[PDB]
Design a protein around this motif. Structure first.
Motif, mmCIF file in Angstrom:
data_model
loop_
_atom_site.group_PDB
_atom_site.id
_atom_site.type_symbol
_atom_site.label_atom_id
_atom_site.label_comp_id
_atom_site.label_asym_id
_atom_site.label_seq_id
_atom_site.Cartn_x
_atom_site.Cartn_y
_atom_site.Cartn_z
ATOM 1 N N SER B 684 -6.849 -15.098 5.754
ATOM 2 C CA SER B 684 -5.888 -15.742 4.717
ATOM 3 C C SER B 684 -6.826 -15.509 3.344
ATOM 4 O O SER B 684 -6.113 -15.209 2.286
ATOM 5 N N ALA B 685 -8.029 -15.501 3.238
ATOM 6 C CA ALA B 685 -8.722 -15.293 2.082
ATOM 7 C C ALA B 685 -8.624 -13.798 1.577
ATOM 8 O O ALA B 685 -8.820 -13.481 0.312
ATOM 9 N N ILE B 686 -8.284 -13.028 2.473
ATOM 10 C CA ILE B 686 -8.250 -11.463 2.258
ATOM 11 C C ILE B 686 -6.828 -11.345 1.442
ATOM 12 O O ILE B 686 -6.541 -10.567 0.551
ATOM 13 N N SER B 687 -5.776 -11.857 2.559
ATOM 14 C CA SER B 687 -4.546 -11.789 1.910
ATOM 15 C C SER B 687 -3.954 -12.317 0.653
ATOM 16 O O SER B 687 -3.027 -11.901 0.227
ATOM 17 N N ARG B 688 -4.844 -13.404 0.301
ATOM 18 C CA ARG B 688 -4.500 -13.924 -1.104
ATOM 19 C C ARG B 688 -4.897 -13.209 -2.161
ATOM 20 O O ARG B 688 -4.870 -13.640 -3.523
ATOM 21 N N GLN B 689 -5.651 -12.141 -1.951
ATOM 22 C CA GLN B 689 -6.158 -11.168 -3.163
ATOM 23 C C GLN B 689 -5.483 -9.940 -3.432
ATOM 24 O O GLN B 689 -5.658 -9.351 -4.374
ATOM 25 N N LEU B 690 -4.462 -9.658 -2.346
ATOM 26 C CA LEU B 690 -3.680 -8.676 -2.622
ATOM 27 C C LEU B 690 -2.493 -8.695 -3.626
ATOM 28 O O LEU B 690 -2.087 -9.803 -3.679
ATOM 29 N N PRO B 691 -1.977 -7.666 -4.276
ATOM 30 C CA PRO B 691 -0.569 -7.706 -4.916
ATOM 31 C C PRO B 691 0.523 -8.138 -3.732
ATOM 32 O O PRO B 691 0.247 -7.972 -2.587
ATOM 33 N N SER B 692 1.669 -8.205 -4.372
ATOM 34 C CA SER B 692 2.911 -8.592 -3.900
ATOM 35 C C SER B 692 3.452 -7.431 -3.118
ATOM 36 O O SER B 692 2.846 -6.307 -3.122
ATOM 37 N N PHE B 693 4.477 -7.692 -2.480
ATOM 38 C CA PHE B 693 5.183 -6.722 -1.727
ATOM 39 C C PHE B 693 5.798 -5.354 -2.551
ATOM 40 O O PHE B 693 5.465 -4.163 -2.587
ATOM 41 N N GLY B 694 6.697 -5.845 -3.351
ATOM 42 C CA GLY B 694 7.385 -4.693 -4.397
ATOM 43 C C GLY B 694 7.195 -4.950 -5.651
ATOM 44 O O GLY B 694 8.090 -4.860 -6.672
ATOM 45 N N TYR B 695 5.759 -4.916 -6.078
ATOM 46 C CA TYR B 695 5.245 -5.246 -7.390
ATOM 47 C C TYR B 695 5.326 -3.963 -8.306
ATOM 48 O O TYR B 695 5.511 -2.778 -7.491
ATOM 49 N N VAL B 696 5.245 -4.140 -9.482
ATOM 50 C CA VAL B 696 4.868 -3.252 -10.560
ATOM 51 C C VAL B 696 3.614 -3.440 -10.989
ATOM 52 O O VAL B 696 3.323 -4.523 -10.986
ATOM 53 N N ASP B 697 2.901 -2.311 -11.238
ATOM 54 C CA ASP B 697 1.569 -2.531 -11.626
ATOM 55 C C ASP B 697 1.191 -2.398 -13.327
ATOM 56 O O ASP B 697 1.833 -1.535 -13.707
ATOM 57 N N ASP B 698 0.363 -3.300 -13.645
ATOM 58 C CA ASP B 698 0.093 -3.343 -15.106
ATOM 59 C C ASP B 698 -1.439 -3.160 -15.414
ATOM 60 O O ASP B 698 -1.725 -2.908 -16.580
ATOM 61 N N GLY B 699 -2.092 -3.089 -14.354
ATOM 62 C CA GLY B 699 -3.636 -2.954 -14.604
ATOM 63 C C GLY B 699 -4.416 -3.985 -14.548
ATOM 64 O O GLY B 699 -5.569 -3.857 -14.283
ATOM 65 N N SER B 700 -3.950 -5.058 -14.460
ATOM 66 C CA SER B 700 -4.534 -6.476 -14.351
ATOM 67 C C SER B 700 -5.087 -6.655 -12.671
ATOM 68 O O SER B 700 -5.985 -7.657 -12.541
ATOM 69 N N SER B 701 -4.350 -6.180 -11.911
ATOM 70 C CA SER B 701 -4.729 -6.454 -10.463
ATOM 71 C C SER B 701 -5.992 -5.667 -10.102
ATOM 72 O O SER B 701 -6.514 -4.598 -10.648
ATOM 73 N N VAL B 702 -6.679 -6.557 -9.331
ATOM 74 C CA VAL B 702 -8.207 -6.077 -8.934
ATOM 75 C C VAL B 702 -8.015 -4.814 -8.073
ATOM 76 O O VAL B 702 -9.149 -4.068 -8.191
ATOM 77 N N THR B 703 -6.981 -4.802 -7.187
ATOM 78 C CA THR B 703 -6.840 -3.446 -6.544
ATOM 79 C C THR B 703 -5.219 -3.023 -6.722
ATOM 80 O O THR B 703 -4.436 -3.837 -7.085
ATOM 81 N N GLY B 704 -5.021 -1.640 -6.615
ATOM 82 C CA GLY B 704 -4.029 -1.060 -6.783
ATOM 83 C C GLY B 704 -4.111 0.519 -7.038
ATOM 84 O O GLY B 704 -5.041 1.134 -6.651
#
Ligand code: SAM
Ligand code: SAM
Lengths: 49, 1024, 49
Positions: B684-704
Motif C-alpha cells: 500500500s505504501a508503494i501504491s500510494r506513490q504512483l500516479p493515477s490510472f488515466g492521468y496526464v503528466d505535468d512533470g511534478s510526479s516523482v515517476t512517469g
C-alpha cells in the motif's frame, strides 16, 4: 491617435500610414527675431520680448 | 548546410563513364516503327495508390505530336490506345516501305526531324507526303532542313543558318488522369507547345540570332551532348497546373525536371556503370535580366549549378515522382534563407569548381571552365541511406569530457518537452494469484487470541482507498473468483486427518455453495463449478452435486445467510458471503456479521465434514470469537491467502466439524499474520506513490514518462542547445531504456526521444554537480525514417525475467544496508554503475571492475573513483579507503573466469580484504541453503562437479557450503560476526521494481525467490 | 505559418473552430488567419480586434 501602436496594420494599414505621416511630417514651429526691444520696448506678454 | 531546402553535406558524387552515341538508321526506324512485344517506343506511367495507368511517356520515333489532342482523337484506355497505335504505325510502316526499298537503303542514317514530324503528321492526317523525300539525309542533318524548299510551317521553318522547330509531347495524358496527389507530374510536357527549340551549328550564330529575337521567358542550353545538334531552347508562357499550392510556368518546369533528374543521377553513380549523359542540367543563358534574385527561376538555376557540380539531396527521392513530393520540394525551395554555398550562377558560361568530381570538362570542348579560385571543403563519396524501420528502436548514450550547469539543461528540456500529454498506462501486476498458506500443527505453540495482530486503524482513509483502487484497476486478470477458487481448492484438498490416514475430502461429496453471483461473462454461475464438476482442474476429484445459495443466484435460491433457513445438510460447504454489502461500513456490525456467518456455516455443515469461510476484516473480536467457539469443535484447520488484489482479506478453512477437541492458535499462524499485514502495509505504501490510472503528466510526479522532440535538418552537426537538451534528458532519465524515432512531421524532419524517470533517477540527479554532455555522433549518423508509436507507461508486457527480479532483490538489500554519509566501494559494477542509484547522495563511492566503464569522469558533488585493475589480485587495496565492500553477481563470475574453485576464490578475496580498513561487509556468495530441487529450465545443478549451469546465460559457477564459508571467515577474523539475511516473503523489495516502472510477474517472481534460496547473500561484521 | 518557428506557441480556439467552419462553408476565411496565433490572452484579441 495619440499612441500609434493601438492601430494594427493588419486591420487599418493606410490609416496607420496616415497617422505615421502626421506624427513624422507635421511642420515644426520655429521662432524669429523682430523689432528693437532695447529702446522701443515690447508688448509681448507671454513670449520673451 | 542548406540553400532553402537542405542538401546533403559532407559528400558529393557524379557519374564518370559516358556512352558513345549511335546514329539512328532506317532499319532502326523501321524496328521502332513496328511495335514488338519486348520493346516499344512508349513506356506507361502508373498511379501510386491505385496502380492505374494514367500517363504515357513517349520516345524517339513518336515525339512530334505538336498538334492539339482533339486533332488526333486517341481512345482513353491504355490497351485500346496501344492497339490503335500498333495498327496505325503498321499502316505507316507499309507506306514508308512502299516508298523506300530496304535492301538498297539498309545502312544509311535517317533524319530525326523528318521522322518525328512524319509520325506526328500521319497521326493527325495533315498531308505527310511532302516529308517523304526529306527522310533520307545527306551532307548533314541540319542543312537539308535549311536549304530545303518544301513549305511546311507546322513543324519547322528556316531563318538563315538557324532552324527553329516546335518540340512537343514528351508525356501524354490519359482520360483517368485527374490531378490526384499520387499522380506523376508531367512538367507541362503534355500540352500543344511548351517550348520552341532553335537549332544551328555554332553558338556565335545562335547568339547573333538572339539579338533581334526576344528572351522574355529565358532560353536554356544543354552543352553536354544535345539531342540533334548544338541548340538553344526557348520556353513559352504556358503554365503547369498539376502542383496544387503554386503555379509555375514552362521553362521553370523544364529546369526543375532536369535538376531533379540530375539529383537522381548523382546518387546512383557507381563508378563503373555508364550513363547516357554526364549532366542534364540546362544553365539558363539569356533571360537573367528579366528573372532576378529571390525568384524561383533564379533559385532553380542555383540548384541546377549545384547539381552540375555534383551535390546530393539530404532526403531520398522516390523512384516514381509524385505531385505531393514535387509540391513539398518546391515549397521547400521558396522560403527564407541565404545561399550558403560559394557557387553562384554565372551568365557567360557554366562554371565547375576545382575539386568537383565531374569529368564533363574532358568530354566537352565548349561551355565548362575549371575555376581554380573557389574550392569546396567537403570530401568525395557517394550517398549511403540506411534502411528505415516501422518500430522505435533503443538508444544508448555515450558521454564526453565537457560539462555545463544543471539548471541550464533543465531550462532547455523545459523548452523542448511535449510533456503535457496522456500516456497509456499498462498493467502493474500480471499472472496468476500468488498463494500463501499456513496450517495447524499440534507441536508449535499455544498463544492467546489477544496477541495476534489486526487491521491498521488508517485503513479506510482516502489515500488507502486510492492505493487499493489503483492496484485493483491496474492489475490484469481473467476471473478473480475463478483464480481464487482454484487456489483455495488446490490448497484445501491437500489436508490429511489425524484420526484416519487418508484425507478429509474425497469424491462424491455433495457440496454447497454460498454467495453465488450470476454475471461472469460466461455461464450464469461462478466459473469454477462446471470445470470442478468435470474434473478439469486435475488436482481435485469431482463432487457429486453442487447447489448454490446467496443473494445473486441464477440456478439456486436467494436467502439471507446470516440467520438460518430451510435447507438440507451438506457434507461440504464453501462460503464467500462478504461483509461489505450487508455491513453498514463499520467494524462492529462487520464483526457481528462474521460471527453470524460462522454460526450459520457451522450449523449447516452435516457433521464429519468441512467448510471454507472468507473474512474481509480480521479483527480482534473475530479472532477471539473463532478461538472461543469454533476451535473446540473442529479437528484441524488451515487459513490460507490467494494474493491477487492488495487487501487484508484471508480465507479460513476448517476440517472435521462437531468433534470435541482442544485447538488454539500457533506461533506459525502469528508469523503468517505478521507477514500478511506487513506485506499489505508495504504494498500500500508503494501504491500510494504512483500516479493515477488515466492521468496526464505535468512533470511534478516523482515517476512517469517524459519526451522531447527537436528537429534535425538532413546531415548536420547539431548545435550546442540540442546537445545540452538531450544530455539534460539523459541526466533526468538516469540509464533506463531510451527509445528514439525519426519521422517527417508536417514538413519537417524531427526526432523524438522517449524514456521514463524514477526516484532512483532523482537520486542520481542529486548525486552530480555539473551536467555532462553526450557524444551526438550516434544520432548524427542516423538517416532512417523510424516511425513512432504512442507512449506507454509500462512498456514490458511479457513481464520481468527472474534474473532481473533477483538483481532488484540484491539492489534492495544493498540500498537497505548502506546508511547515509558513509564511504563505500563495490567489486564489479560493469560499464555502468547501478550502485549510483542505490547509495545516498552524500555517500562517496569507489567502484572497481576490469571492464572499462561508461559513466562520466568528473562532475560529481561527492567523491567518485573509477579504476580497472582486476580486484581479485594483490597490491592495490592499501591506498583504497572504504568502510563497506559489496560484491554482487561477480565472485562466481571471477571464479569461473580464473577456472578455479569457489573456496579458493573466496579465500583469495578474503586475503586481499584483510589488508583493507573496512569493518562491515556483505557480498553475494554461491551457497546451497536449502535442499536442492534443481530448478527446471533456470538453474540445473551439477551434483558431481559442483557447477550451476544457467541455461538462459550459458554460464556455470562453482559453489560450496556455508560450513566452509564460515570456516574461512573464522580463519580470517576470529571476532567476525557472520550472518545470513533471509528472503523477503513480504515483497519489501518491490519498491525498486515498481517505482522504476516495470511490470513484474507472478511465475517469474516465484522462480526468482526459489532461485534466491540457492544463492543468498551473507553479511560480515569483523567486530563484535 | 511555418511550423519550425511556430511549433511551441498556443493557438486560438475560437479562430480555429471558426476557421474550420468557414472553410467548410466557403465564406471568406482569409481574414481569420492573422488571428490564429494568440497573444496577451485568448479573449482580448477577439475583443480589441
Ligand atoms: C460474497 S461476495 C462476492 C462473491 C463472489 N461474487 C463469488 O461469486 O464468489 C458478495 C455477494 O454475496 C451475496 N450474498 C448472499 N448473502 C449475503 C449476505 N447475507 N451478506 C452479504 N452478501 C451476501 C451477495 O448477493 C453478493 O453478490
Ligand atoms: C557486470 S558484473 C555483474 C554484477 C553487477 N554488479 C550486477 O549487479 O549486475 C560482472 C563484471 O564483473 C567483473 N569482474 C569479474 N571478475 C573480476 C575480477 N577478478 N577482477 C575485476 N573485475 C571482475 C567483470 O569485468 C564483469 O564485467
Amino acid at each position: 491617435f495619440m499612441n500609434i501602436q493601438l492601430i494594427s496594420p493588419i486591420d487599418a494599414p493606410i490609416l496607420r500610414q496616415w497617422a505615421e505621416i502626421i506624427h513624422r511630417y507635421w511642420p515644426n514651429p520655429s521662432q524669429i527675431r523682430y523689432g528693437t526691444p532695447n529702446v522701443f520696448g515690447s508688448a509681448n506678454l507671454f513670449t520673451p520680448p | 548546410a542548406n540553400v532553402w531546402g537542405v542538401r546533403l553535406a559532407d559528400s558529393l558524387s557524379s557519374p564518370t563513364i559516358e556512352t558513345r552515341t549511335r546514329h539512328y538508321t532506317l532499319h532502326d526506324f523501321y524496328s521502332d516503327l513496328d511495335a514488338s512485344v519486348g520493346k516499344e517506343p512508349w513506356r506507361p506511367l502508373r498511379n501510386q495508390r491505385t496502380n492505374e495507368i494514367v500517363a504515357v511517356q513517349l520516345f524517339r520515333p513518336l515525339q512530334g505530336l505538336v498538334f492539339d489532342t482533339q486533332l488526333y482523337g486517341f481512345p482513353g484506355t491504355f490497351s485500346q490506345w496501344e492497339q490503335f497505335m500498333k495498327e496505325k504505325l503498321r499502316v505507316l510502316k507499309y507506306e514508308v516501305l512502299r516508298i523506300y526499298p530496304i535492301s538498297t537503303y539498309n545502312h544509311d542514317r535517317v533524319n530525326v526531324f523528318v521522322a518525328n514530324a512524319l509520325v506526328g503528321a500521319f497521326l493527325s492526317n495533315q498531308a505527310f507526303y511532302d516529308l517523304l523525300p526529306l527522310l533520307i539525309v545527306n551532307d548533314t542533318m541540319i542543312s537539308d532542313l535549311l536549304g530545303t524548299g518544301a513549305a511546311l510551317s507546322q513543324f519547322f521553318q528556316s531563318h538563315g543558318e538557324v532552324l527553329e522547330v516546335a518540340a512537343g509531347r514528351k508525356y501524354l495524358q490519359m482520360n483517368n488522369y485527374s490531378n490526384d496527389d499520387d499522380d506523376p507530374p508531367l512538367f507541362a510536357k503534355d500540352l500543344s507547345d511548351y517550348a520552341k527549340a532553335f537549332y544551328s551549328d555554332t553558338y556565335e550564330v545562335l547568339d547573333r540570332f538572339f539579338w533581334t529575337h526576344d528572351s522574355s521567358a529565358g532560353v536554356l542550353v544543354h552543352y553536354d551532348k544535345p539531342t540533334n545538334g548544338n541548340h538553344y531552347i526557348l520556353g513559352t508562357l504556358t503554365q503547369m497546373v498539376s502542383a496544387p499550392p503554386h503555379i509555375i510556368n514552362a521553362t521553370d518546369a523544364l529546369l526543375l525536371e532536369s535538376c531533379l533528374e540530375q539529383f537522381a543521377a548523382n546518387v546512383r553513380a557507381r563508378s563503373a556503370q555508364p550513363v547516357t549523359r554526364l549532366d542534364q542540367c540546362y544553365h539558363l543563358r539569356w533571360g537573367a535580366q528579366y528573372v532576378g534574385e529571390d525568384s524561383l527561376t533564379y533559385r532553380l538555376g542555383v540548384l541546377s549549378l549545384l547539381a552540375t557540380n555534383g551535390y546530393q539531396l539530404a532526403r531520398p527521392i522516390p523512384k516514381q515522382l509524385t505531385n505531393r513530393w514535387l509540391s513539398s520540394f518546391v515549397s521547400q525551395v521558396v522560403s527564407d534563407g541565404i545561399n550558403e554555398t560559394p557557387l553562384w550562377p554565372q551568365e557567360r558560361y557554366v562554371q565547375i569548381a576545382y575539386d568537383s568530381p565531374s569529368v564533363v570538362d574532358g568530354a566537352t570542348q565548349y561551355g565548362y571552365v575549371r575555376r581554380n579560385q573557389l574550392r569546396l571543403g567537403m570530401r568525395i563519396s557517394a550517398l549511403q541511406s540506411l534502411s528505415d524501420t516501422p518500430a522505435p528502436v533503443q538508444w544508448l548514450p555515450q558521454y564526453t569530457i565537457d560539462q555545463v550547469a544543471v539548471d541550464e539543461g533543465d531550462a532547455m528540456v523545459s523548452q523542448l518537452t511535449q510533456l503535457p500529454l496522456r500516456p497509456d498506462y499498462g498493467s502493474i501486476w500480471i499472472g496468476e494469484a500468488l498463494s500463501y498458506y499456513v496450517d495447524y500443527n499440534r507441536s508449535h505453540r499455544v498463544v492467546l487470541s489477544s496477541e495476534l495482530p489486526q487491521l491498521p486503524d488508517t485503513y479506510f482513509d482516502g489515500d488507502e482507498q486510492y492505493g487499493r483502487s489503483l492496484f485493483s484497476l491496474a492489475r490484469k486478470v481473467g476471473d478473480r473468483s475463478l483464480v481464487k477458487d482454484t487456489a483455495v481448492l488446490k490448497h484445501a484438498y491437500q489436508a490429511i486427518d489425524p484420526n484416519t490416514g487418508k484425507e478429509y475430502l474425497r469424491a462424491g461429496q455433495s457440496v454447497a455453495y454460498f454467495g453465488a453471483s450470476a454475471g461472469h461473462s460466461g455461464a450464469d454461475q461462478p466459473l469454477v463449478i462446471e470445470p470442478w464438476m468435470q474434473g478439469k482442474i486435475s488436482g481435485v476429484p469431482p463432487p457429486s452435486s453442487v447447489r448454490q445459495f446467496g443473494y445473486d443466484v441464477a440456478k439456486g435460491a436467494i436467502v439471507d445467510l446470516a440467520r438460518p433457513f430451510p435447507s438440507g445438510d451438506y457434507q461440504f460447504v464453501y462460503s464467500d458471503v462478504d461483509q461489505v454489502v450487508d455491513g453498514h461500513d463499520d467494524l462492529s456490525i462487520s464483526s457481528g456479521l462474521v460471527e453470524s456467518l460462522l454460526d450459520s456455516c457451522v450449523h449447516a455443515t452435516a457433521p464429519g465434514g468441512s467448510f471454507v469461510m472468507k473474512i474481509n476484516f480480521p479483527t480482534r473480536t473475530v479472532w477471539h470469537y473463532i478461538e472461543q467457539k469454533i476451535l473446540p469443535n473442529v479437528t484441524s484447520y488451515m487459513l490460507i491467502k490467494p494474493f491477487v488484489t492488495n487487501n487484508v482479506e484471508v480465507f479460513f478453512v476448517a476440517f472435521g466439524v462437531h468433534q470435541q477437541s482442544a485447538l488454539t492458535w500457533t506461533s506459525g499462524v502469528y508469523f503468517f499474520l505478521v507477514d500478511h499485514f506487513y506485506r499489505y502495509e508495504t504494498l500500500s505504501a508503494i501504491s500510494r506513490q504512483l500516479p493515477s490510472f488515466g492521468y496526464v503528466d505535468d512533470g511534478s510526479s516523482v515517476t512517469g514518462i517524459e519526451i522531447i522532440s527537436i528537429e534535425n535538418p538532413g546531415f548536420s552537426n547539431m548545435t550546442q542547445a540540442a546537445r545540452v537538451g538531450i544530455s539534460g534528458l539523459c541526466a533526468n532519465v538516469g540509464n533506463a531504456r531510451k527509445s528514439i524515432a525519426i519521422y517527417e512531421s508536417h514538413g519537417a524532419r524531427v526526432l523524438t526521444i522517449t524514456s521514463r524517470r524514477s526516484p532512483a533517477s532523482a537520486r542520481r540527479k542529486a548525486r552530480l554537480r555539473y551536467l555532462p554532455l553526450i557524444d551526438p555522433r550516434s544520432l548524427e549518423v542516423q538517416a532512417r525514417t523510424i516511425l513512432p508509436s504512442n507512449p506507454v507507461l509500462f512498456d514490458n508486457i511479457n513481464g520481468a525475467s527472474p534474473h532481473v527480479c533477483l538483481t532488484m532483490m540484491y539492489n534492495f538489500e544493498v540500498s537497505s544496508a548502506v546508511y547515509d554519509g558513509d564511504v563505500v566501494l563495490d567489486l564489479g559494477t560493469g560499464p555502468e554503475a547501478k550502485i549510483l542509484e542505490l547509495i545516498p547522495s552524500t555517500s562517496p563511492v569507489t567502484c572497481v571492475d576490469i571492464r572499462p566503464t561508461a559513466q562520466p569522469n568528473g562532475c560529481w558533488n561527492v567523491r567518485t573513483t573509477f579504476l580497472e585493475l582486476d580486484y581479485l589480485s594483490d597490491g592495490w587495496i592499501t591506498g583504497v579507503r572504504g568502510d563497506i565492500v559489496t560484491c554482487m553477481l561477480s565472485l562466481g563470475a571471477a571464479a569461473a573466469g580464473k577456472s578455479m574453485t569457489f573456496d579458493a576464490a573466496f579465500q583469495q578475496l578474503v586475503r586481499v580484504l584483510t589488508r583493507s580498513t573496512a569493518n562491515v561487509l556483505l557480498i553475494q556468495v554461491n551457497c546451497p541453503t536449502d535442499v536442492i530441487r534443481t530448478i527446471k529450465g533456470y538453474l540445473e545443478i551439477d551434483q558431481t562437479n559442483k557447477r550451476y549451469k544457467f541455461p538462459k546465460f550459458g554460464r556455470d559457477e562453482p559453489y560450496s557450503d556455508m560450513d566452509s564459508l564460515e570456516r574461512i571467515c573464522r580463519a580470517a577474523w576470529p571476532n567476525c560476526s557472520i550472518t545470513w539475511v533471509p528472503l523477503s516473503y513480504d515483497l519489501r523489495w518491490t519498491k525498486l521494481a515498481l517505482l522504476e516502472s516495470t511490470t513484474l510477474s507472478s511465475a517469474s517472481v516465484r522462480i526468482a525467490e526459489l532461485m534466491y534460496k540457492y544463492m543468498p547473500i551473507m553479511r560480515i561484521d569483523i567486530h563484535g
